[PDB]
RNA sequence: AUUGUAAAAA
RNA sequence: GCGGGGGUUGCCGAGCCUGGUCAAAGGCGGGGGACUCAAGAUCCCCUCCCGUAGGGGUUCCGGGGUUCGAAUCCCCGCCCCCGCACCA
């Protein structure tokens, strides 16, 4: 498993740093050769491509497109056959930081087999296909009922997304102790009646695609009496009624009561499993509510605390410019291992924060999450790579710094 | 020439406390509802097999409310004593309906805390799951300062005007009120009554000799503790919206006086709007002074998407707003860790908006008001601190130092209360 | 008794 | 199920009825080239594995038997296809 943490980190890197690989013209070929195809068929069809790009229009674009078909044509004869995973190749030339130019030539075999085909030349590379390599946990639907309105939305990971929502008016005057029940019934027995209807309408328009639920199931959230009328409806009957994961009694509606419907339905979704990560950021937090001391937070504490014992869970945040550096000492024949961020790192002479100003000479640098991925099993049990999109996620990154741990002993801290 | 004062009275109570039943008496006993009407309420309730709700059906209006014997939407009813005109506010006996309960709390000045003495019904009201907590955090949040504690259901099978249950009620409330909304021990008034038979509402009971104080209708009339009238450039929070005779808008006049035929402007909205008819409390006026619960017919460009929980304001001197702010928070039962990036839903007046804490300022003591000179990672249960806060959208606010009824806030998440908030600096 | 895509007109 | 006939090198198909003169004709396809800007007709070369000197190693479904020697002769196994029939 600890070996797939590293893979996902690599893929995140790869994915981002292939859009940041932009060039100009049609100098940026993406080629995806599927499982066990015909090397000669592809290599030929690229000599048919080089032949038509020997016209192409616009001087430097020709010459660059040619040199980038040439790179693949040469390396594709290295392969004996198309492996079971197919070959993903990305050849072109890119401008990078400082407005400098680099001829980019990538040719690899995906860890998990690619399930798509593509020969396409833009001015940037295509990265949409590599998302399919890590693939899905789901993807839930959420109906939020309230006496002022209703809201259709999804929860995928830790991200609440709002798809659609309408508001309703009801006459909150019926008399003054001498109550008129004709005022009661008249408009309401049609507002309420048309509203359970329209909830079921906007549930069938939004949560059904190609004869099937797009989301994995529905969680239904609402105030009293409006939901036991909607669940057991003939309007909600068939496919939606048989995908009802959990219900939830809530105190409010809208986006307010979209939050409260997840708070209450957390363990019944499950496995989301990013929701269950937010639970476990819950669990870290309510260690820190007590005197029992198996918690650490920040870099400093957390670090020396992993060095002198073991964490059950080591909890790190996905985006994270903090890194493990190893500096030799200015005096020679001694060394320092320090954690820096982009700002400190630019002062290459001290490689430290401006207030300290201490002198150093950097030899190697491993990203702090990458360093952790590669040793969590020698320093503890389990690692969690974590999101910010939930209210527990938000808090971890903002007020702990997206780094802390649930230890296996009583620690003490600064 | 002589004016009777216009203020509302509100009933906050246990879920089963008979908030409707006491309502039904108090109109009948002041003649506001006719004998014919009580006969018809008797009949309609009997014919559908609902005998013990005859009085309750005077306030419980909707089907589910009539069926169960306690409200879900907020109900308003008018009665008149010798010195005053009242609109009385039944606040939901169900707990999923907190938006009807905040609008009921908001129109108060005066809140009547109705506690049932019945075995089972009494004890259950003081648990976390009861409605007494949610009702006291709302009355304090709405400006309430004189609490009337009415011990209901006292002539019943299991209560014989028990002085012991009555003392149990008093004793339990002084710390429960003191803890949930920071109430002091005094400006509290206790009275036993029964709603079903109307005992101690207008006349003295002889089953009860030990209580020789005033009944509820003679008392309420003669209570001096009303602080509603506030002079100043004019402010109305919208508490309810609805169409009847034209489009109508309800709220409390929490600064100054607005005359019929004249402009308002709404806020943050800035929506020009003219009055068409003024019913102050529940009778026609053409002039209306501050502190009165207004029931105004409006004429605007919009009228059915008009949002409750924003203010109307002077057109003329419009009014402070956020959406960024610093504030003092006091952590009663999260009960776990809040650090920065914490979220909740935000109650001030009739507003119920999402909010998040941006950066966390400093720790503050309960005593002396003294802040720490360093800044923390986090805050925990039973502490107090200062935090910066962003709302999802934009709310209009006063500072607590300006007007506390537009400044005192409640950190709501679950069916619980995490902190009580006090807005200090309105940004930008 | 074949085949050849993308930025030119005071 | 009972039978019957088959499975050849990248593919297709000779040749196995003639045991040593089979590392396996031919076709198609692949690879390298000329062809005279570019394809690309046409033609030529190469095309089991391994190796520095036409050497070593392994093949005609899998595995044995018979022979000095079998891809070629005999048997069993797996797999495929086809009749007929109880049952599937």
Numbering used by the authors:
A (entry chain A): 7 to 420
B (entry chain B): 207 to 634
What does the paper say about this structure?
Eukaryotic termination is mediated by two directly interacting release factors: eRF1, which is responsible for stop codon recognition and triggering peptide release, and eRF3, a GTPase that strongly stimulates peptide release by eRF1 in a GTP-dependent manner (1–3). eRF1, in turn, stabilizes binding of GTP to eRF3 so that they form a stable ternary complex, and is required for eRF3’s ribosome-dependent GTPase activity. eRF1 has omnipotent decoding capacity and recognizes all three stop codons. It comprises N-terminal (N), middle (M) and C-terminal (C) domains. Domain N is involved in stop codon recognition. eRF3 consists of the essential C-terminal region comprising GTP-binding (G) domain and β-barrel domains 2 and 3, which are homologous to elongation factors EF-Tu and eEF1A, and a non-conserved N-terminal region that is not essential for termination. eRF1’s C and M domains interact with eRF3 (15,25). eRF1 and eRF3 bind to the pre-termination complexes (pre-TCs) as an eRF1•eRF3•GTP ternary complex, but peptide release does not occur until eRF3 hydrolyzes GTP.
One of these classes (25% of the particles) had P-site tRNA along with well-defined eRF1 and eRF3 densities. eRF1’s N-domain reaches deep into the decoding center, establishing multiple contacts with the 40S subunit, including h18, h30, h31, h34 and h44 of 18S rRNA and ribosomal proteins rpS30e and rpS31e. In our structure, mRNA occupies its normal position in the decoding center, and eRF1’s N-domain interacts directly with the stop codon, primarily via the TASNIKS58–64 motif, consistent with ultraviolet cross-linking of the stop codon to this element. The TASN residues appear to be close to the first position of the stop codon, I to the second and KS to the third. Thus, the β-sheet supporting the GTS and YCF motifs interacts with H69 of 28S rRNA, whereas the continuous density between helix α2 and the P-site tRNA (which is particularly strong between S46 at the tip of α2 and nucleotide 30 of the tRNALeu anticodon stem-loop) indicates likely contact between eRF1 and P-site tRNA. The topology of eRF1’s M domain is now clearly visible, folded back onto eRF3, with the GGQ loop close to the switch I region, similarly to the interaction between Dom34’s central domain with Hbs1 (40) and aRF1 domain B with aEF1α, whereas α-helix 8 interacts with eRF3’s domain 3, close to the conserved GRFTLRD613–619 motif.
